[PDB]
Design an enzyme around this catalytic site. Sequence first.
Site, PDB file in Angstrom:
ATOM      1  N   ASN D 114       0.789  -1.224   0.000  1.00 40.53           N
ATOM      2  CA  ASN D 114       0.000   0.000   0.000  1.00 40.53           C
ATOM      3  C   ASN D 114       0.825   1.279   0.000  1.00 40.53           C
ATOM      4  OD1 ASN D 114       0.869  -0.090   2.756  1.00 40.53           O
ATOM      5  ND2 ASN D 114      -0.999  -1.217   3.282  1.00 40.53           N
ATOM      6  N   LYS D 166      -0.443 -17.862 -34.783  1.00 39.41           N
ATOM      7  CA  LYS D 166      -1.276 -16.723 -35.106  1.00 39.41           C
ATOM      8  C   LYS D 166      -2.371 -17.136 -36.081  1.00 39.41           C
ATOM      9  CE  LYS D 166       1.634 -14.378 -32.722  1.00 39.41           C
ATOM     10  NZ  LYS D 166       1.335 -13.621 -31.478  1.00 39.41           N
ATOM     11  N   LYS D 168      -4.014 -14.878 -32.747  1.00 37.67           N
ATOM     12  CA  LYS D 168      -4.074 -15.207 -31.329  1.00 37.67           C
ATOM     13  C   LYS D 168      -5.311 -16.041 -31.023  1.00 37.67           C
ATOM     14  CE  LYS D 168      -3.432 -11.491 -28.862  1.00 37.67           C
ATOM     15  NZ  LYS D 168      -2.205 -11.905 -28.127  1.00 37.67           N
ATOM     16  N   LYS D 192       3.972 -22.323 -29.258  1.00 33.62           N
ATOM     17  CA  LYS D 192       3.337 -21.924 -28.012  1.00 33.62           C
ATOM     18  C   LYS D 192       1.932 -21.381 -28.189  1.00 33.62           C
ATOM     19  CE  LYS D 192       4.463 -18.192 -25.964  1.00 33.62           C
ATOM     20  NZ  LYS D 192       3.247 -17.380 -26.205  1.00 33.62           N
ATOM     21  N   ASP D 194      -0.883 -18.594 -27.534  1.00 35.60           N
ATOM     22  CA  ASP D 194      -1.015 -17.196 -27.175  1.00 35.60           C
ATOM     23  C   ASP D 194      -1.528 -17.089 -25.745  1.00 35.60           C
ATOM     24  OD1 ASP D 194      -0.827 -14.449 -28.561  1.00 35.60           O
ATOM     25  OD2 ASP D 194      -2.735 -14.344 -27.476  1.00 35.60           O
ATOM     26  N   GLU D 195      -1.052 -16.067 -25.034  1.00 36.61           N
ATOM     27  CA  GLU D 195      -1.398 -15.910 -23.626  1.00 36.61           C
ATOM     28  C   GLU D 195      -2.895 -15.722 -23.412  1.00 36.61           C
ATOM     29  OE1 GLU D 195      -0.420 -13.753 -25.608  1.00 36.61           O
ATOM     30  OE2 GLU D 195      -1.083 -11.729 -25.101  1.00 36.61           O
ATOM     31  N   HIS D 285       4.947 -16.551 -19.162  1.00 31.88           N
ATOM     32  CA  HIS D 285       4.591 -15.397 -19.971  1.00 31.88           C
ATOM     33  C   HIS D 285       4.291 -14.222 -19.051  1.00 31.88           C
ATOM     34  CE1 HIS D 285       2.502 -12.991 -23.080  1.00 31.88           C
ATOM     35  NE2 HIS D 285       3.157 -13.745 -23.945  1.00 31.88           N
ATOM     36  N   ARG D 286       4.808 -13.049 -19.404  1.00 29.59           N
ATOM     37  CA  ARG D 286       4.733 -11.876 -18.537  1.00 29.59           C
ATOM     38  C   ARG D 286       3.586 -10.953 -18.918  1.00 29.59           C
ATOM     39  NH1 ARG D 286       9.764  -7.897 -19.938  1.00 29.59           N
ATOM     40  NH2 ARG D 286       9.213  -7.482 -22.121  1.00 29.59           N
ATOM     41  N   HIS D 318       9.685 -14.488 -20.363  1.00 28.00           N
ATOM     42  CA  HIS D 318       9.833 -13.454 -21.374  1.00 28.00           C
ATOM     43  C   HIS D 318      10.593 -12.267 -20.802  1.00 28.00           C
ATOM     44  CE1 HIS D 318       6.992 -14.758 -24.700  1.00 28.00           C
ATOM     45  NE2 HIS D 318       6.909 -15.722 -23.803  1.00 28.00           N
ATOM     46  N   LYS D 325       8.766  -5.214 -31.315  1.00 21.60           N
ATOM     47  CA  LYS D 325       7.624  -4.311 -31.248  1.00 21.60           C
ATOM     48  C   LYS D 325       7.275  -3.883 -29.828  1.00 21.60           C
ATOM     49  CE  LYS D 325       3.519  -7.214 -30.617  1.00 21.60           C
ATOM     50  NZ  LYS D 325       3.594  -8.598 -31.155  1.00 21.60           N
ATOM     51  N   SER D 370      10.486 -12.463 -27.491  1.00 18.88           N
ATOM     52  CA  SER D 370       9.274 -12.636 -28.277  1.00 18.88           C
ATOM     53  C   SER D 370       8.645 -11.286 -28.577  1.00 18.88           C
ATOM     54  CB  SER D 370       8.265 -13.524 -27.544  1.00 18.88           C
ATOM     55  OG  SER D 370       7.132 -13.791 -28.352  1.00 18.88           O
TER      56      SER D 370
HETATM   57  O1  LIG Z   1      -3.269  -0.935   7.181  1.00 18.40           O
HETATM   58  C1  LIG Z   1      -4.302  -0.537   6.762  1.00 18.40           C
HETATM   59  C2  LIG Z   1      -5.046   0.558   7.530  1.00 18.40           C
HETATM   60  O2  LIG Z   1      -4.561   0.614   8.843  1.00 18.40           O
HETATM   61  P1  LIG Z   1      -4.511   2.066   9.619  1.00 18.40           P
HETATM   62  O3  LIG Z   1      -5.804   2.281  10.365  1.00 18.40           O
HETATM   63  O4  LIG Z   1      -3.365   2.093  10.602  1.00 18.40           O
HETATM   64  O5  LIG Z   1      -4.321   3.162   8.602  1.00 18.40           O
HETATM   65  C3  LIG Z   1      -4.871  -1.133   5.469  1.00 18.40           C
HETATM   66  O6  LIG Z   1      -4.244  -2.357   5.212  1.00 18.40           O
HETATM   67  C4  LIG Z   1      -4.623  -0.215   4.274  1.00 18.40           C
HETATM   68  O7  LIG Z   1      -3.886   0.916   4.658  1.00 18.40           O
HETATM   69  C5  LIG Z   1      -5.965   0.207   3.687  1.00 18.40           C
HETATM   70  O8  LIG Z   1      -5.740   1.040   2.589  1.00 18.40           O
HETATM   71  P2  LIG Z   1      -5.997   0.449   1.073  1.00 18.40           P
HETATM   72  O9  LIG Z   1      -7.382   0.815   0.608  1.00 18.40           O
HETATM   73  O10 LIG Z   1      -4.978   1.031   0.125  1.00 18.40           O
HETATM   74  O11 LIG Z   1      -5.862  -1.052   1.102  1.00 18.40           O
HETATM   75  O1  LIG Z   2       2.417 -12.382 -29.141  1.00 19.54           O
HETATM   76  C1  LIG Z   2       3.562 -12.350 -28.841  1.00 19.54           C
HETATM   77  C2  LIG Z   2       4.619 -12.233 -29.940  1.00 19.54           C
HETATM   78  O2  LIG Z   2       4.053 -12.603 -31.168  1.00 19.54           O
HETATM   79  P1  LIG Z   2       4.569 -11.864 -32.546  1.00 19.54           P
HETATM   80  O3  LIG Z   2       5.715 -12.646 -33.135  1.00 19.54           O
HETATM   81  O4  LIG Z   2       3.448 -11.797 -33.554  1.00 19.54           O
HETATM   82  O5  LIG Z   2       5.023 -10.465 -32.214  1.00 19.54           O
HETATM   83  C3  LIG Z   2       3.955 -12.433 -27.361  1.00 19.54           C
HETATM   84  O6  LIG Z   2       2.879 -12.944 -26.627  1.00 19.54           O
HETATM   85  C4  LIG Z   2       4.300 -11.057 -26.795  1.00 19.54           C
HETATM   86  O7  LIG Z   2       4.113 -10.058 -27.764  1.00 19.54           O
HETATM   87  C5  LIG Z   2       5.749 -11.065 -26.322  1.00 19.54           C
HETATM   88  O8  LIG Z   2       6.063  -9.809 -25.797  1.00 19.54           O
HETATM   89  P2  LIG Z   2       6.211  -9.641 -24.166  1.00 19.54           P
HETATM   90  O9  LIG Z   2       7.657  -9.769 -23.767  1.00 19.54           O
HETATM   91  O10 LIG Z   2       5.694  -8.286 -23.750  1.00 19.54           O
HETATM   92  O11 LIG Z   2       5.410 -10.720 -23.486  1.00 19.54           O
HETATM   93 MG   LIG Z   3      -3.030  -3.647   6.116  1.00 22.09          MG
HETATM   94 MG   LIG Z   4       1.111 -13.798 -26.943  1.00 19.24          MG
END
Ligand SMILES: O=C(COP(=O)(O)O)[C@H](O)[C@H](O)COP(=O)(O)O
Ligand SMILES: O=C(COP(=O)(O)O)[C@H](O)[C@H](O)COP(=O)(O)O
Ligand SMILES: [Mg+2]
Ligand SMILES: [Mg+2]
Lengths: 107, 107, 465, 465, 465, 149
Positions: D114, D166, D168, D192, D194-195, D285-286, D318, D325, D370
Amino acid sequence: MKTLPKERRYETLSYLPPLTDQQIEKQINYCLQMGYIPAVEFNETSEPEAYYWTMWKLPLFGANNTRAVLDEIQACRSEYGNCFIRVVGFDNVKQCQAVSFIVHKPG
Amino acid sequence: MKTLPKERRYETLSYLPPLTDQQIEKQINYCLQMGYIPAVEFNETSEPEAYYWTMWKLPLFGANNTRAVLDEIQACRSEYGNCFIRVVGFDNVKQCQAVSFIVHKPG
Amino acid sequence: GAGYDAGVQDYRLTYYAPDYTPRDTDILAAFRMTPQPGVPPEECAAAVAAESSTGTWTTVWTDLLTDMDRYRGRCYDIEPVPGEDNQYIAYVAYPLDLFEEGSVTNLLTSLVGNVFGFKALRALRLEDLRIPVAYVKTFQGPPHGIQVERDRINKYGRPLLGCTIKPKLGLSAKNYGRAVYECLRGGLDFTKDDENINSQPFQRWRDRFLFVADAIHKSQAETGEIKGHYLNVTAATCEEMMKRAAYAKELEMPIVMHDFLTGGFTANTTLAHWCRDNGILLHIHRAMHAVIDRQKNHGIHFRVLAKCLRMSGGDHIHTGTVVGKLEGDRAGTLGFVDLLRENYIEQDKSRGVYFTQDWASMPGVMAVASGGIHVWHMPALVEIFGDDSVLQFGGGTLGHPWGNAPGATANRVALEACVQARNEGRNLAREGGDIIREACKWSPELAAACELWKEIKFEFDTVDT
Amino acid sequence: GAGYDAGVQDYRLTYYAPDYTPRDTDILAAFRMTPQPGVPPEECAAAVAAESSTGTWTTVWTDLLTDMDRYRGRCYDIEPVPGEDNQYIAYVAYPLDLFEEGSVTNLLTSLVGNVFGFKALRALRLEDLRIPVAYVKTFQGPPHGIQVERDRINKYGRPLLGCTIKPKLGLSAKNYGRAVYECLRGGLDFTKDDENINSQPFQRWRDRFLFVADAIHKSQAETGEIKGHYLNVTAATCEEMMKRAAYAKELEMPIVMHDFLTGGFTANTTLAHWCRDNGILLHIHRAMHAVIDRQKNHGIHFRVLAKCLRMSGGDHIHTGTVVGKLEGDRAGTLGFVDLLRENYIEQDKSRGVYFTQDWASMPGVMAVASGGIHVWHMPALVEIFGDDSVLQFGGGTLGHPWGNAPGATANRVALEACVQARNEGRNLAREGGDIIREACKWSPELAAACELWKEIKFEFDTVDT
Amino acid sequence: GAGYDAGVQDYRLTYYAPDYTPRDTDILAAFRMTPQPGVPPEECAAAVAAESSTGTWTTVWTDLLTDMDRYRGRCYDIEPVPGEDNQYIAYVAYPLDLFEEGSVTNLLTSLVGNVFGFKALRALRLEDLRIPVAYVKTFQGPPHGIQVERDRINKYGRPLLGCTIKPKLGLSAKNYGRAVYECLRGGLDFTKDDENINSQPFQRWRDRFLFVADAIHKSQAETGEIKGHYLNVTAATCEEMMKRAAYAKELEMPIVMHDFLTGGFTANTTLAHWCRDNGILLHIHRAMHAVIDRQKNHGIHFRVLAKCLRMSGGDHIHTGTVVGKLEGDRAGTLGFVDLLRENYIEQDKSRGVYFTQDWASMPGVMAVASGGIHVWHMPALVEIFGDDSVLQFGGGTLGHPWGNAPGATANRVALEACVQARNEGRNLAREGGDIIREACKWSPELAAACELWKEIKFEFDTVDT
Amino acid sequence: GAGYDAGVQDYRLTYYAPDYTPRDTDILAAFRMTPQPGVPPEECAAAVAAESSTGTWTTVWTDLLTDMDRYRGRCYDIEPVPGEDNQYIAYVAYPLDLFEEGSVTNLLTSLVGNVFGFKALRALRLEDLRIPVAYVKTFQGPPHGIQVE
Ligand SMILES: O=C(COP(=O)(O)O)[C@H](O)[C@H](O)COP(=O)(O)O
Ligand SMILES: O=C(COP(=O)(O)O)[C@H](O)[C@H](O)COP(=O)(O)O
Ligand SMILES: [Mg+2]
Ligand SMILES: [Mg+2]
Ligand SMILES: O=C(COP(=O)(O)O)[C@H](O)[C@H](O)COP(=O)(O)O
Ligand SMILES: [Mg+2]
């Protein structure tokens, strides 16, 4: 447009033209420069599922020259002429094979 | 340094030179002296997974002489010349096979 | 119905019965006992019996709401050890009623639980154990035993050959499997995990299992002989050990290994029952045995642990090579090898057999000779252990100049020549070097092995004779 | 033992320790902090440390029934960022005691929970994380890692090649499998999902799995090389993810894919443990990473998520192609690729490595390039990532004029020529076009690919440098 | 049936349909888009739609073996944002066929997967989402929802009251339970775990669960009101989360807490289904939300995550207090609180509701106001959120001078006075201080609380308005 | 990249590093060691370290397909015990990489596995163990502990 033919491959450096012994010499030189231990493996088949080929003699731990590895390779060729023969490079820092190319197909 | 060849083996006494019938005679003599019952088994193959070969006649329970076992062995050789033939020794005190060597390869 | 006498009293009054003859259902224990100066030996033995069966330091009134004489351990004999001012062998008999059926753990907890730290005692060694037939019947014993194992691996007429992959720790799973393949294709029946190899950052156990299984399949296909690799399933927990054993079963592995002392007897018995239930052979490594069994004056002699491992369960067990890098006397090793392999072993003090032991058809355990041996020790080992044994050459195979496979072949040729000469009627203990020399004349791998290790020999003082 | 002071007080009094040196077991966090005008920077950093470890807005009397100094997060350094009126890098140290062992989720909830929405803060970015060795040891890490993966797929000496099928979304399961087969038989190691492809009305996941497995078997039989397809097991629930993973295991698939951010770290760690337990590789995959890690002033830099994914578990991840791109700078990508793959990475501010990170033999993660790349980027990628990487050509393979298989072959030939020239001793960054040109002279598929995409190039301003 | 054109082409040709009207089953996304200088806005929006639905960088021949127009995402509107040189709101419509039924993870992976890192894009924010009724029907929604929760805890006519036990980390399980008991016996409906409290060396989760359950039973027995404690079941893995949830069920706990972002949506949906299946309320903590939703120009607005959490499942969700220590504007918070609680919410750009959202009787989610609030904020909160909300005073209860229980009572009295005055027909926003003052005249705990925190107030610039 | 030398060699060459300082992640073992008469104490300690970590009696060629120095146990100190003709405390350091995380069984099997029965050794006692914090973190520890109990 051309249809891709059906050919059996042999992992790294198989989708390149027939490997001249000069390029093989350069590959073994490269694995010597990186500190990789070269070894010569052979097998009757080249199935991908096969993890292990048969080791020819022992890995060239004391090797420092490409001609010595080439001599082991030709010795394996003479002893096994109907065997796939490949040259592997063992990296021992990470303990992983770092080079693997085929030098001979069954004659 | 020499690379070990790929040879198919046949269990006990297979990594020794070709067994002279004199040495076979001594082996059967040894199993007679220990009280082992000799028997002659044969099979078309020598796969390790195979537990059972086919028994030739019956085990020589009344045997007291190596020549009798040699006669059974040569009889099996004559009847099955394309079969692996081995000589087994049954120890009945512990009920376990105590001798097992091959006397014939497919010819 | 006696009254209740609160207060301490001598142990010898109610725990030293020198006239008592042992019942055939009793557990008999031989103790090498060294008491403190000024402590009566019989009182010391009575304390051992009392604190090992029922005795407390003072009298408890709950002893009266019982029949004490039917549970009390009794020292029925004390005899001085030759050449000892204060060392005696005490024979203590325990009723069969004291011990949980089928539990080696409970037997040891009762026997060797806390008496070894008695203040009035200076040193205590448990030399031997008579396990009655009635108690033996409550255990599973080895999951298979020698004869069933030989039937299952289809190997007869010679000792088996094995090797530990070296280095112990450091190799990747794939290189480990490659070494396993090279050893196995050369003629070794078995390869094995080092007892330290369980699952480490450089080598996860599942990858090791996969690669080892592949190497086993390749070498079996090549040689046409049953190949095996002892897969160490020793783990932190019983669940993890069971997962490793289950994966070894899934990969169609014939044998798994366990450390019964560092792993423990509870997990060992669990694994032995599992092995019997799933047709898996059980190789038993005795890691940490020398912590307990090295000294003559204190500890537990390995024959006691060997009987306990036979009952708890194991198809193989390490016994020491006599002539290798690890300590074990010839006579005592012969004694406990007969104890592990035979059905009936008669009393023999000269071999450390303090009691006649009958196994009531409990299958025997294969003897494993491992540690600092090469081809030159091969005749003597064939002389010592015979066929129903495993000979393990870790450094004697991988340390061969030509590689794993030629070293395996050299060992196989030496073993087969020794077996052949033994069968023919030669004196192996006399002409072992002769047999090795002729085989070297025929075998180049053997020639290189013998010329490499000709002057390698471990001899020291025998601390445990 | 102090008294209890009810009321609010400054955070800097008890949470800013500029003299404190970090313990080696501490978790170290580097924060790019932009406070509101008129908010002291040190007070802002103290608020970050307090609200990330133990601090509340006012004083609580339950702080006294504790040893606060052993749990409080401390800001031990604040240094202004160059060329910034109100942007500072704050180094905050957290005791190892604050974090649940083996939980990436808990680590992130403590760190990035937070504090990023603090009103006194204008912008906050978590740039880097020092994970101590003691904390690293509590995680499984990657199920296999780079070297075990290379051993398992029997692929050495080059980067791996992959492709996303492709379009996707839209393809039927059978046509999807046909495209997979055509790509794989052409020379790609992997294909692979597609995600976005999880299980849709046009394509149920079980049909996709079946057809993909069949295509993998066919192409493996044809080429004689290990072929794979990342099967997206990302699902709505953990039970569904586990069912998809189990079916992938049943079909003997070597690798599965998961989105660790949209799926979540709980499910990711579950799947990584499952993958380790069942010998399955884990491609990561990210998806949704750029929502968090795109801006320089706010969010979490991808190197933090990369360390967390390495600990939670993943064999591939990844990393961005640099030259494709999608956005990622060269130096920062080099930094977190070394963080993901190496065991020891020294401090380097020039590459975004704010802390020296030691992985204590935690296996490295394969780097996946990728997105928007073709054969022309092939040399540079081989220069950038090296062998221990996966190069993914979705449109660069299926977009080839002749079809999936010729495009796969063109990519394989370009990759192999680049690797060969690199091994021979050529300057890939200099003669990459030269290598591609000679290979095209030899490879017609490569010639068509290069003539198709010669003038395709993604260059824009680097928002994250 | 068109031919195949290999090569790259503009996205706007096939992905920008400005004449297209949205189908009622489409998913509608509003994107705040800032493209690079010299990048056409419509091309940028077309790239967003293409890479979020089906588009690749170049043309693929597998597009032809499909009906692309039935799956392609289309940007049907682009309108410039007021006072922005390069910032536009793009409305993109996605066919219902693209998304996995009942999967929030798949929806987010499709929408916010990789378009936020497009090189041609400088900044992207997902402002709002229209979830069609047909898609809403495929989700479980909240396990119970507001009305079922109120029925289950037998609490009507007022906002609920809660508190987080402070300090966040450091307290032992027993002292934690004691603080829980003191807070609950004072009048708080609920207590809760800090989002960082999962299972730590100073406090194992099972001990915390046991002691909290005992405190809940004691305070329920004392006050005669249903007492609860949000037990954080957030864990490293789904198995561990399920074990913690199962133990909370075993201890007869009515509610558990989860972090849906750091834990993930897969595990959140798993836990929500489990909660529905076992009658357990699900409090949802939004830890790491501000990493995504803090900046106006980039990220995902919290209303999108709130809709996704409503569908994935949660009975409570944190929404921000407006007037507390954490950032959230009044209008946008009102908007997404109506989105979370109401069945029908009409389009309102002034409150950030870019689309009319119909929930088709999906139960609403309780709003949780937590963070930096005391009794002085009580009227405004009662004005803002109303009854169907939870007001959480962590430091506003434990930070009371007299202790946890008097602070809980002070908050309960302030809340009840505010509710009474609201019901009577008073202007809470106007006479809130008046109501607090009369209650203090009657309540000494309230008097001490108000005199402690009279001059405590968090006001800064609103970064998200 | 050294060559392969088949044959036995002294343990002290590669397992006795008296200059080595212990890393903070190492496992440290103190051994009360009584060697046989005529056995060098440092050779005895090197044998203990080798057979407890990686050493075999002879040289194996598979040592070369590895980084041995990152796994080998090293005896970094030997000091004679007071009033002892042949009893020394040897301090042996083991890399954290050698041990299975969370397994006491594996730790003991590595440490006290077979070195106590070395023929060149007369008596061996494991006196103390330094468990590094990084290794401690991999264990559960007591289910509850004193304060929770
Ligand atoms: O710790 C607390 C509040 O405790 P306190 O009463 O000491 O502030 C909660 O986990 C988050 O801060 C809530 O906020 P959010 O909406 O970002 O999750
Ligand atoms: O679809 C693709 C690539 O296919 P293409 O060859 O058609 O570009 C992958 O899922 C992400 O684009 C990789 O990028 P990232 O690292 O952001 O996951
Ligand atoms: Mg808390
Ligand atoms: Mg993909
Ligand atoms: O490592 C080995 C032998 O390998 P090597 O061939 O290199 O000596 C074994 O684990 C034990 O040493 C056997 O002895 P014990 O009977 O004490 O278990
Ligand atoms: Mg060993």
